[PDB]
Structure 1
Amino acid sequence: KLPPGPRPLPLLGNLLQMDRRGLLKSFLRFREKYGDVFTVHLGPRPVVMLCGVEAIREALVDKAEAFSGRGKIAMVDPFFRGYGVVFANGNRWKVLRRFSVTTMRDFGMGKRSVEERIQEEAQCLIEELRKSKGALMDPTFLFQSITANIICSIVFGKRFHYQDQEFLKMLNLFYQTFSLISSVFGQLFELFSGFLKHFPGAHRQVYKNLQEINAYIGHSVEKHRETLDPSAPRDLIDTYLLHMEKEKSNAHSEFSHQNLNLNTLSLFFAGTETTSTTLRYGFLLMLKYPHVAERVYREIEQVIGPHRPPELHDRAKMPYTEAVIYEIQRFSDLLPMGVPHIVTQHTSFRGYIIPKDTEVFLILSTALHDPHYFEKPDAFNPDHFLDANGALKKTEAFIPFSLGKRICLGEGIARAELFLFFTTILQNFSMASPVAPEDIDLTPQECGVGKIPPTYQIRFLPRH
């Protein structure tokens, strides 16, 4: 039998037992009653929730033969339709995961490492903040520009300038789209898309925004193909175009133009909106807890100094700064319910039977807030990741990128981005804002698929 859960009504599923504050709060109320493994009916679909690091790990690691499927996010399914690595399943996922892992890591002889691309971008960012004259800003656009530019360097062999209005228009579409998908309407759509799709709504705007970004991608593909040198691929798009040409006699080849456009858009969305949202939370946390920002700056002065650019080899020597970044990720809890999975075959789990095709949510938020691993888990406290001697204390509960076959494929890049960009900004700038620390409100602006911080203003003041 499926795991236990609240009794549903036909058509409405468990609607009348949900919490108006959203899906995550609804599921944490059900966890109170049912424990770590339970079923909730989201409209017409039974979805099994797994909570706590033990259960999520038993599923994604111990039973990866069954739990490695990708489930559906209703607000974006109409667009992606199972194309791209994020939303693919089956053999398509195998091929696209392998291609994407290889091309996001290996760039050719004579090409910059991920590290150098981040270090270059971080110097562009510092120059922009110096030219910002200490003015107030919402730093969103810059955190999206630096993260998007790392991916653009890999995918398109170039970066965009921070002043490029056409680049900013695309970043505005990523930002609005992640907010829409995470809205109360987007969560209602997860329950009732069958019915709601026939009316006007945010799902239509999400579709329009994604198509607008994808239009750029399609045109870039067309240009790349026009100038492609098979002997010298310039970037990930050329590499995929050479696979496409190799397999062109197979009508079923997975190297198709829809996979190319949507894999590429998936890489940008996942690599831009994630890390820039974490940076957004990270700097709002530094405004609320300036003594943490001061102690990081102390550590940068002591290990790096005021001038030499941070490098990844510095991390080992900077346990307090790394604890801070771990704690920003833990606290931010970017994807509280992770990204939906589905089971790929009939599975037994803890005495229950989960039929092939059942959707499963791994509630990552419950690991990141497990009070056995993090004392007082609702408070921001970098000591969560430090032992008594101030050495870094890593923990198996720290799973913000998930686990198993679908584990975030950008994990290495994201962690390098968080560390180089956080340290290079704090090396050169301190932070201030009009709101006193006591008054800063960390309550997210949206909390659905994504947890998104409230807008805020910040100044970066040059040091010395």
Structure 2
Amino acid sequence: LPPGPLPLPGLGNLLHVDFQNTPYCFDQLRRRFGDVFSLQLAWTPVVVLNGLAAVREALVTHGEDTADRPPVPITQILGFGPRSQGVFLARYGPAWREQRRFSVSTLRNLKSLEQWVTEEAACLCAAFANHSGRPFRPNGLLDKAVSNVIASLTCGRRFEYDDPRFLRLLDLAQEGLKEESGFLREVLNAVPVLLHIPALAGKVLRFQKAFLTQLDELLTEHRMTWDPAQPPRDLTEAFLAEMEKAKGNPESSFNDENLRIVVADLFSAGMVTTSTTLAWGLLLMILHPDVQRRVQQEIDDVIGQVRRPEMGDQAHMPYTTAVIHEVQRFGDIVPLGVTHMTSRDIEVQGFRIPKGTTLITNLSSVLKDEAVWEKPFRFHPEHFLDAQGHFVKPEAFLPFSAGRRACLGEPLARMELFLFFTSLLQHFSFSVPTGQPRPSHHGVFAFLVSPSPYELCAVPR
């Protein structure tokens, strides 16, 4: 029932959409066909969901029937199997629930973690300071800091900012991540041209393949040293202990094939999502020093200029919390979220969506819904503050989406964000370089929006 552009025969309408700037075209279609609209990519049926109401209805109200994930043809090059699907793209079932339940459970046992982020935050602060006067791109440093946190939890160790193996991981990660979006990936899935045609099959997802084999290196290295008599200190070990405990049946999702994919899912996700947000954070603090100052004093009032920040401070810091949430909302890191699929027929905003329809939850249309925020497209921290200035998180705040598939990294993310953000502003003040012009608000698109290239200088307080 949703209204869609007519699909030209053969390729469908995958021409009509620009996959190197997707969020734009989905907005340009939302203005003719309205809030809910549907497009055909070749055989595949799709129904883009825009605005809070339409999203919440599918993911929460009809959540039990939209938790599944649509199949990806091009995954074959990675070598995915029903046996090993990881978490991120695994189909709604026991294999997914096992790894999902294992993931969040294992992170919790691994206060202790709280201290570890601040430790890493130091090494970051230092790296920052070591360029006191000169302008520099903080994107790369943040990437390293955040990556060491998720590395600890999963690989048991942290890496030096100079380590070649480490920097190669980071690079492949960001490049692999771009691969997720584009023209070639979408059209490959649709038609069997990918198969038995090495020329394209090789080029697409290439970096991710290079990324995984650099992970397998780290894993086999890590596996070789795993001593069973020692309780797990990292997820890899914890997983290995499960592979031992569950050697009984080959049906279990705990296997060598899954280990690399699961660890990849968590390791990669922690690496870029938080780090990009922190890049947006610093940016919005140099283009809005007025907001930067207010936070900076609040820090001094509660935390102080001398002791490292602790999660227990967030409670007593309404502005810093509202800014961060605003940074995420405005940042709009993951515009179209992650593709969903209907397990059965459902109804959204009147229209009726048939089973097997790929769903695209446009979180941007929610994070910036006109009927919710007072100043949607402007950086307005007061979107999370009431009359007496107490923090309040609105429903429409869904940077982590919602439903059974909602981000299982939110707790970690929340922890990482607040601790890194405050630790930075506490010991530093960030301004645009004197000579340099105003850096753009707008963000480049590579599946996830990132702050357009910019520089800043960091000076102690």
Preserved contact between residue 315 and residue 322 of structure 1 (Cα < 8 Å): yes
CA-CA distance at 1:80 after TM superposition: 6.6
Unaligned runs of at least 5 residues, structure 1: none
2: distance between equivalents of 1:307 and 1:401? 33
After superposition, the C-alpha distances for 1:277-310 in whole angstroms (9 at most, x for unaligned) are 1111111111211111111112111121111111
SS at match of 1:308: coil
CA-CA distance at 1:258 after TM superposition: 1.6
Evaluate the alpha carbon distance shift between residue 402 and residue 75 of structure 1 in structure 2; reply closer, same or farther with a 3 A threshold: farther
User: Out of 422, 444, 450, which is 2:448 matched to?
Assistant: 450
Aligned positions, number:
453
Give runs of aligned pairs for residues 259-408 of structure 1, distance below 5 A. Answer: 259-408=258-407
SS at match of 2:205: helix
Segment of structure 1 superposing worse, 244-253 or 316-325 = 244-253
CA-CA distance at 1:262 after TM superposition: 0.7
CA-CA distance at 1:265 after TM superposition: 0.9
User: Out of 57, 80, 87, which is 1:85 matched to?
Assistant: 87
Segment of structure 1 superposing worse, 344-353 or 131-140 = 344-353
SS at match of 1:360: strand
Counterpart for residue 209 of structure 1: 207
Counterpart for residue 94 of structure 1: 97
2: distance between equivalents of 1:154 and 1:25? 37
CA-CA distance at 1:216 after TM superposition: 3.4
CA-CA distance at 1:177 after TM superposition: 2.4
Give runs of aligned pairs for residues 213-232 of structure 1, distance below 5 A. Answer: 213-232=211-230
CA-CA distance at 1:133 after TM superposition: 3.7
Preserved contact between residue 8 and residue 41 of structure 1 (Cα < 8 Å): yes
Preserved contact between residue 289 and residue 437 of structure 1 (Cα < 8 Å): no
TM-score (normalizing by structure 1) = 0.90
Counterpart for residue 103 of structure 1: 106
1: distance between equivalents of 2:263 and 2:19? 35
1: distance between equivalents of 2:130 and 2:39? 52
Evaluate the alpha carbon distance shift between residue 188 and residue 443 of structure 1 in structure 2; reply closer, same or farther with a 3 A threshold: farther
SS at match of 1:59: helix
CA-CA distance at 1:433 after TM superposition: 3.0
Segment of structure 1 superposing worse, 37-46 or 275-284 = 37-46
After superposition, the C-alpha distances for 1:150-191 in whole angstroms (9 at most, x for unaligned) are 111111111111121221121111122223434xxx145324
Segment of structure 1 superposing worse, 418-427 or 16-25 = 16-25
Segment of structure 1 superposing worse, 148-157 or 40-49 = 40-49
Evaluate the alpha carbon distance shift between residue 36 and residue 193 of structure 1 in structure 2; reply closer, same or farther with a 3 A threshold: same
TM-score (normalizing by structure 2) = 0.91
Counterpart for residue 13 of structure 1: 12
After superposition, the C-alpha distances for 1:42-87 in whole angstroms (9 at most, x for unaligned) are 2332111111112211111111210001235777674373621111
Preserved contact between residue 270 and residue 409 of structure 2 (Cα < 8 Å): yes
Counterpart for residue 127 of structure 2: 128
After superposition, the C-alpha distances for 1:233-273 in whole angstroms (9 at most, x for unaligned) are 23211111121122224233211112100111111111111
1: distance between equivalents of 2:325 and 2:456? 22
2: distance between equivalents of 1:436 and 1:369? 33
Residues 1:189 and 2:173 are matched in the alignment: no
Evaluate the alpha carbon distance shift between residue 157 and residue 444 of structure 1 in structure 2; reply closer, same or farther with a 3 A threshold: same
> What code does the residue aligned with 2:185 have?
F
Evaluate the alpha carbon distance shift between residue 104 and residue 413 of structure 1 in structure 2; reply closer, same or farther with a 3 A threshold: same
2: distance between equivalents of 1:351 and 1:421? 44
2: distance between equivalents of 1:438 and 1:389? 37
Evaluate the alpha carbon distance shift between residue 432 and residue 318 of structure 1 in structure 2; reply closer, same or farther with a 3 A threshold: same
Preserved contact between residue 38 and residue 50 of structure 1 (Cα < 8 Å): yes
Segment of structure 1 superposing worse, 31-40 or 367-376 = 31-40
SS at match of 2:78: helix
Preserved contact between residue 81 and residue 87 of structure 1 (Cα < 8 Å): no
Counterpart for residue 461 of structure 1: 459
CA-CA distance at 1:356 after TM superposition: 2.7
2: distance between equivalents of 1:192 and 1:218? 26
CA-CA distance at 1:421 after TM superposition: 0.4
2: distance between equivalents of 1:435 and 1:13? 51
Counterpart for residue 141 of structure 2: 142
Segment of structure 1 superposing worse, 148-157 or 449-458 = 449-458
Segment of structure 1 superposing worse, 173-182 or 358-367 = 173-182
Q: Which runs of 4+ in 1 moved over 6 A?
A: 73-77, 435-438
1: distance between equivalents of 2:74 and 2:137? 27
> What code does the residue aligned with 2:86 have?
G
2: distance between equivalents of 1:394 and 1:292? 19
Evaluate the alpha carbon distance shift between residue 54 and residue 304 of structure 1 in structure 2; reply closer, same or farther with a 3 A threshold: same
CA-CA distance at 1:354 after TM superposition: 2.9
1: distance between equivalents of 2:300 and 2:405? 38
1: distance between equivalents of 2:77 and 2:36? 29
Give runs of aligned pairs for residues 3-82 of structure 1, distance below 5 A. Answer: 3-15=2-14, 17-18=16-17, 22-71=21-70, 78-79=77-78, 81=80
CA-CA distance at 1:352 after TM superposition: 4.0
Evaluate the alpha carbon distance shift between residue 457 and residue 152 of structure 1 in structure 2; reply closer, same or farther with a 3 A threshold: same
CA-CA distance at 1:313 after TM superposition: 0.9
Counterpart for residue 171 of structure 1: 170
Evaluate the alpha carbon distance shift between residue 113 and residue 28 of structure 1 in structure 2; reply closer, same or farther with a 3 A threshold: same
Preserved contact between residue 73 and residue 340 of structure 1 (Cα < 8 Å): no
The alignment's C-alpha RMSD in Å is 2.4
Counterpart for residue 245 of structure 2: 246
Evaluate the alpha carbon distance shift between residue 418 and residue 204 of structure 1 in structure 2; reply closer, same or farther with a 3 A threshold: farther
Unaligned runs of at least 5 residues, structure 2: none
Identity of aligned residues (%): 42
SS at match of 2:38: strand
Evaluate the alpha carbon distance shift between residue 32 and residue 308 of structure 1 in structure 2; reply closer, same or farther with a 3 A threshold: same
Evaluate the alpha carbon distance shift between residue 67 and residue 7 of structure 1 in structure 2; reply closer, same or farther with a 3 A threshold: same
